[PDB]
Amino acid sequence: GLNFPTYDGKDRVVSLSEKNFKQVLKKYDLLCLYYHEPVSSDKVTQKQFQLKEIVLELVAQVLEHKAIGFVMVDAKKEAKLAKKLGFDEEGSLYILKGDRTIEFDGEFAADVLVEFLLDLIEDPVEIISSKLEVQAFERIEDYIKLIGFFKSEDSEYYKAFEEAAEHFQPYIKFFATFDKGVAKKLSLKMNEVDFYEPFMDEPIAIPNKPYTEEELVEFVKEHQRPTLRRLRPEEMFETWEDDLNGIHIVAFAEKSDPDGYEFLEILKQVARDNTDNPDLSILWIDPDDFPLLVAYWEKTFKIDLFRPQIGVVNVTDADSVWMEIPDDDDLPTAEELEDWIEDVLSGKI
Amino acid sequence: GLNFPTYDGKDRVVSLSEKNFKQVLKKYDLLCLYYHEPVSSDKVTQKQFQLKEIVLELVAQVLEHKAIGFVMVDAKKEAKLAKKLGFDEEGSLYILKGDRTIEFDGEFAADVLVEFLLDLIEDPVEIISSKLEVQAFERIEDYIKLIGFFKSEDSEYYKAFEEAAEHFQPYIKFFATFDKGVAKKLSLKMNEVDFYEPFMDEPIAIPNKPYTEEELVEFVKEHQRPTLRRLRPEEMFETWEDDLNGIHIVAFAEKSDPDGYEFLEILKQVARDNTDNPDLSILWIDPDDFPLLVAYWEKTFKIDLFRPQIGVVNVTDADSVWMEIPDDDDLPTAEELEDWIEDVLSGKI
Numbered sequence: 001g002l003n004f005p006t007y008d009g010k011d012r013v014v015s016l017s018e019k020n021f022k023q024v025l026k027k028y029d030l031l032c033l034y035y036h037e038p039v040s041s042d043k044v045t046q047k048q049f050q051l052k053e054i055v056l057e058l059v060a061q062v063l064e065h066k067a068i069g070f071v072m073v074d075a076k077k078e079a080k081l082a083k084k085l086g087f088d089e090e091g092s093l094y095i096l097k098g099d100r101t102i103e104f105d106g107e108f109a110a111d112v113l114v115e116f117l118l119d120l121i122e123d124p125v126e127i128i129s130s131k132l133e134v135q136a137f138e139r140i141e142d143y144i145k146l147i148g149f150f151k152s153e154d155s156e157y158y159k160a161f162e163e164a165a166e167h168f169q170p171y172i173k174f175f176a177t178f179d180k181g182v183a184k185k186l187s188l189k190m191n192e193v194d195f196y197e198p199f200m201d202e203p204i205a206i207p208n209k210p211y212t213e214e215e216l217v218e219f220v221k222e223h224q225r226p227t228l229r230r231l232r233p234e235e236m237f238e239t240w241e242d243d244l245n246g247i248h249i250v251a252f253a254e255k256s257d258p259d260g261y262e263f264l265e266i267l268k269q270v271a272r273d274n275t276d277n278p279d280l281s282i283l284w285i286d287p288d289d290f291p292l293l294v295a296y297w298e299k300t301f302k303i304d305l306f307r308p309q310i311g312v313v314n315v316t317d318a319d320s321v322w323m324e325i326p327d328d329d330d331l332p333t334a335e336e337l338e339d340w341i342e343d344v345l346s347g348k349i
Numbered sequence: 350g351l352n353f354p355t356y357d358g359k360d361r362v363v364s365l366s367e368k369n370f371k372q373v374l375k376k377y378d379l380l381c382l383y384y385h386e387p388v389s390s391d392k393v394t395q396k397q398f399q400l401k402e403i404v405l406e407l408v409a410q411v412l413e414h415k416a417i418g419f420v421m422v423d424a425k426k427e428a429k430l431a432k433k434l435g436f437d438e439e440g441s442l443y444i445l446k447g448d449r450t451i452e453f454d455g456e457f458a459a460d461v462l463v464e465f466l467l468d469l470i471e472d473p474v475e476i477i478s479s480k481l482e483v484q485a486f487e488r489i490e491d492y493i494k495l496i497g498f499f500k501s502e503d504s505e506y507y508k509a510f511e512e513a514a515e516h517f518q519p520y521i522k523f524f525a526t527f528d529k530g531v532a533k534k535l536s537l538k539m540n541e542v543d544f545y546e547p548f549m550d551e552p553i554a555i556p557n558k559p560y561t562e563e564e565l566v567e568f569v570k571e572h573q574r575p576t577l578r579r580l581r582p583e584e585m586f587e588t589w590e591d592d593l594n595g596i597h598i599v600a601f602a603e604k605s606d607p608d609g610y611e612f613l614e615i616l617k618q619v620a621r622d623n624t625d626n627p628d629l630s631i632l633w634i635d636p637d638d639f640p641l642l643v644a645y646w647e648k649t650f651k652i653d654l655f656r657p658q659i660g661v662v663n664v665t666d667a668d669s670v671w672m673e674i675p676d677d678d679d680l681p682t683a684e685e686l687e688d689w690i691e692d693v694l695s696g697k698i
Contacts, residue, residue: 001390003397005641041350048352051403062641110458114640118655128607130679136607258477258485291463292354292411306467330479 008064011057015072028069030121031096032104035073035087052108059113067121069096095120099166106234115233124162125174134182137175138201142230145173145196146220147203149183157210161193164216171235172224195219197226199265200272227271228264229283236285236293245280252301252309252322254287259308259331266333270341279342310340321349357413360406364421377418379470380445381453384422384436401457408462416470418445444469448515455583464582473511474523483531486524487550491579494522494545495569496552498532506559510542513565520584521573544568546575548614549621576620577613578632585634585642594629601650601658601671603636608657608680615682619690628691659689670698 079085093104128136150158165174195204253263287294298305301320311322339345428434442453499507514523544553602612636643647654650669660671688694
């Protein structure tokens with residue numbers, strides 16, 4: 001007798017090969033495929049291997065929904081002999097069809113991975129319309145956004161918006177927009193495209209005429225940064241790989257808290273009151289969950305966990321410094337905020 | 350070579366017995382102990398057993414923090430021979446010291462369980478003080494709250510608040526409060542105790558003089574309900590066991606959405622505009638995570654997942670009905686809301 005929500009009976013999804021993979025690829029819309037070797041390793045390896053097989057076939061067998069061809073690229077074989085098929089190394093959860101195909105070197109767990117399954121099989125992006133969707137336009141205070149007024153469901157600019165969103169599954173936001181109501185409320189003069197800031201919700205319009213792939217992918221990949229960065233599931237290490245510095249400049253303040261709302265909105269008060277402030281963008285860990293990595297940061301970001309924290313980590317070997325003189329659990333913020341941001345305070349340590 | 354955050358080297362926390370358990374109990378502050386049998390079962394059982402050992406010793410070994418004596422009550426033995434020691438059956442994650450000892454028949458996963466570890470080792474409850482903690486008083490729009498103005502850190506009423514909060518680890522909220530600032534803002538005439546609604550944030554003062562254990566445990570356990578109920582990790586099945594009906598009256602509307610904010614605040618508009626409305630309290634599933642059980646509700650609550658849903662489940666065998674005629678993905682809410690709440694609309698189906 002198993003448990004809940006443990007797998008349904010037997011591990012049935014597929015570790016496979018070429019012909020199957022091609023028939024089923026051209027049949028399917030989502031293909032979650034990890035490439036792996038013929039694994040037979042040491043003691044400490046087959047444990048994470050077994051947990052990998054288990055989160056895999058648990059999410060799979062517990063799903064059996066219309067979306068995924070699932071599990072493994074068996075080894076080296078025909079991919080290698082074509083070139084490597086233009087792939088990565090001995091491991092990656094490459095997901096097919098998405099854009100054409102995309103990677104997965106994100107983090108491994110249930111809630112996150114099924115979240116990925118659904119919100120990625122979106123097919124395509126965010127259709128907004130009603131007055132309550134006018135509210136949806138002035139709703140998201142969390143992410144960086146990209147709205148656009150368009151002409152049809154089967155439209156040229158609509159298509160560009162779709163395949164550019166699937167090129168940017170990364171994350172951020174993609175509002176497909178219609179009608180004179182939100183047209184008059186938003187006010188961008190024509191059926192165009194408009195970017196938007198996380199908090200300090202600004203319509204940063206994309207400002208020419210018609211716009212295409214590398215142009216709006218230009219606005220997105222060029223200006224994905226702004227002021228504070230909300231860190232999430234895989235988004236911490238993935239914004240590490242998305243161009244860092246070496247100094248992990250973090251604001252560590254969990255939500256459901258005074259320190260969360262106050263830290264968040266005093267740095268974001270520096271954003272929304274000092275619109276510019278280009279001291280390079282500060283990041284935001286705010287531990288509600290992800291406590292394993294919050295334990296990793298409890299020992300490696302010295303000894304800190306449930307406090308109003310803020311500081312930097314010099315990646316490896318040396319140090320991981322934070323807030324010190326001042327501190328106070330009920331922090332001095334305000335102009336002290338203006339300082340200790342505006343260069344850890346202008347003057348160094 | 351293991352992975353991240355996979356366990357540190359070897360599974361070292363303890364499946365033990367009496368003398369050890371007593372020395373270490375009287376030494377420790379948190380004891381996370383599951384009682385189990387000498388397990389040697391069939392094929393489908395030892396899988397969830399292995400995943401149980403693995404989430405267990407993963408959170409443990411990856412923690413090694415100052416809090417827990419950890420893992421297993423080996424079998425029947427001295428507990429049984431004393432009586433059963435006044436325990437449950439062959440299984441429960443009984444956690445010692447907490448109140449004196451408390452259960453755990455909640456859900457099993459990392460983020461949730463470490464969240465439990467920290468927020469339960471709180472030791473004691475929520476000390477609020479500053480003007481930013483005046484903001485903390487008018488901050489939580491999510492939970493049901495219990496503030497109280499007190500006299501000292503080592504105070505009588507303070508103690509009652511502590512051990513009553515640990516009696517109610519259940520959940521809700523517990524604000525220990527001081528000083529004339531939030532005293533004048535809150536205005537309850539003396540150093541007393543005050544309850545508070547989730548949304549429609551109301552100071553429902555606890556209205557006599559001094560108050561004790563079974564009196565404020567009376568206000569809490571008697572009036573923990575109000576209007577809409579935010580469902581969470583274990584809180585769905587645990588508010589099933591916390592007195593249900595049979596009809597699982599749910600509002601199914603995920604956040605990051607028009608349907609989330611609109612459903613949430615139109616039923617909560619019925620709360621905040623119709624202060625009373627005692628049609629018995631409606632619940633609130635809003636799937637950001639917990640997608641396994643959202644899959645369980647995708648097949649068992651008929652066929653629904655990422656929509657503006659709302660309806661009931663007649664527990665077992667028969668049916669699980671929801672919103673039908675009207676529906677619309679951009680819902681008719683307003684007076685239609687007033688109906689389809691105020692008895693699935695007054696008139697039955």
